Amino acid sequence: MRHYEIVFMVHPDQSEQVPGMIERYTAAITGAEGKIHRLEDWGRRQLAYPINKLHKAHYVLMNVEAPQEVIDELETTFRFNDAVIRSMVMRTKHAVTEAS
Amino acid sequence: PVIKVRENEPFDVALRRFKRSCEKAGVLAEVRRREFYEKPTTERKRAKASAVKRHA
Amino acid sequence: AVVKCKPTSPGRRHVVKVVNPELHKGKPFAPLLEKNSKSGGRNNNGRITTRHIGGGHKQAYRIVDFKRNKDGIPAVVERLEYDPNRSANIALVLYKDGERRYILAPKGLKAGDQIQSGVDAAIKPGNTLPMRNIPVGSTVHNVEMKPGKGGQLARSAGTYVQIVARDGAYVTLRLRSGEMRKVEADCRATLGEVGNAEHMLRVLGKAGAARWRGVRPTVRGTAMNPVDHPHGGGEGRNFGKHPVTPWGVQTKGKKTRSNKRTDKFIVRRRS
Amino acid sequence: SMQDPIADMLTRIRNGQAANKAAVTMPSSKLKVAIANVLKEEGFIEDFKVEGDTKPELELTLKYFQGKAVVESIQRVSRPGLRIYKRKDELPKVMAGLGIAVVSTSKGVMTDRAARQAGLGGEIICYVA
């Protein structure tokens, strides 16, 4: 059960939905008996360049200890969802609980 | 090489600064490099030559 | 797989058989069969309207579900089957309510896989949702042109349609020809590419095979006399006129679309 | 791989001679030890020490007469890829008897002269000059 440093940025108008989404993700992770070692909502940050066609995006750092299938599912969801703009699942050695 | 003239500053000086910035970037040089296609082999050879030169 | 036949006879030499062992080796689901008699390319007036059609082999029409109305009810695929009436294979699917329907088999789909139609349905090959719900970028097939009508685009062996944009109430489809086409976003579209893509690699190998399919020999204009076809006559092999149909219309390049009703929907013509 | 130990030893000795090494060490062997002993007897090295129980290291102390090597040359004649066995009559002599041929014989490893005296020969292990 490897670790995953996920960082995804959500469309700034959909900021009200973001917490719910996060919760859902957490549930999913736990559904297949995995941990969520940190979860930092950075909020609406100024982008260095405009992704899609907007200048601010609502960032969500989230670190996981989960299986592969769940991660795949998450990725799929991200792909589907127009709310999220960019995601970045990363593999990470260690639990990396500390704050950024 | 983005520049902007600050309050109370000559034109010439600004221009010079811009030029310096450009040089630092390596924009003109880069452009030159990309004017024509160099074969990877050729590039490698060039690199080697440069390395040799550096060994003074 | 594709199977190049050994040349034990001339006629068998050039044959490439698109074999597909997952297809059901048996009689198809009888309720969904209906009679489909051959025409010979002949209308109510008895006249050969379309040439080079006839003989063939007796076929039973498979009532293939192109509309996909069973919303919410998931369906397991029982078996892929051979449909003689199309280049695609047809998956027989068992909906949990009890109903069995044929669908165009998608690419990845096979026996045991689940499919689903409607708005709630998940994005995975074989599932059918309105193109408002399907994401931009997706390769889809069995696309409806009017909502509720039935899938009319991308039904052939290995075809699909890229959903390329969604400008309001219309999605833009990059059709398999290259024709960019506005279709209403309410129109359904089955996720995935229709799955028999090796179909095109099959080579009949002989005239007989063509005949079996229902394709009577095509005599070339130039082979005929002037009375029958514009490219007619000439002592020896002459052909001193511009390629035309049997009815005199130019055949190399002359565009024959003159719709105007649907030019609104055509974003960019194929090329 | 280490497909000739004696040869390797010889090479090491030669290299030591070349480079002015006071001593030359290697993995010891019974045959090797015998060879060393023979060399000592004949005059080309000072002393050999077989130091160790599980892994014994043969450590030869090389000679340097007048600032140059005593071992002028040291070639393996017999070698794994082509063995050389000489009868008593056939037995070689290195530099017309101003240098030795270490020969392995039914009665021990010894210089060629010794073998001749005995009335036997065998595997001419190495010419040492």
Partner: protein, 65 residues
């Protein structure tokens, strides 16, 4: 003078843009190791981090948009 080594870090963080954007020039280009005096391994890691940032749009690829 390599800073990362001094610090005693296992890996450079893409999220730590404040550190990274000292090692990228004004135009957005990744600054050389020879100039900054970074260790080679660290430099590679740093570069990777920068790339990640760019992808996520914390740092810019170039100074145009």
């Amino acid at each position: 003078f390599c800073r990362f080594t001094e610090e005693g870090v296992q890996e450079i963080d893409y999220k730590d843009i404040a550190t990274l954007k000292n090692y990228i020039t004004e135009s957005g280009k990744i600054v050389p190791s020879r100039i900054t005096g970074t260790r080679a391994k660290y430099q590679r890691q740093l570069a990777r981090a920068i790339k990640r940032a760019r992808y996520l749009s914390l740092l810019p690829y170039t100074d145009r948009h």
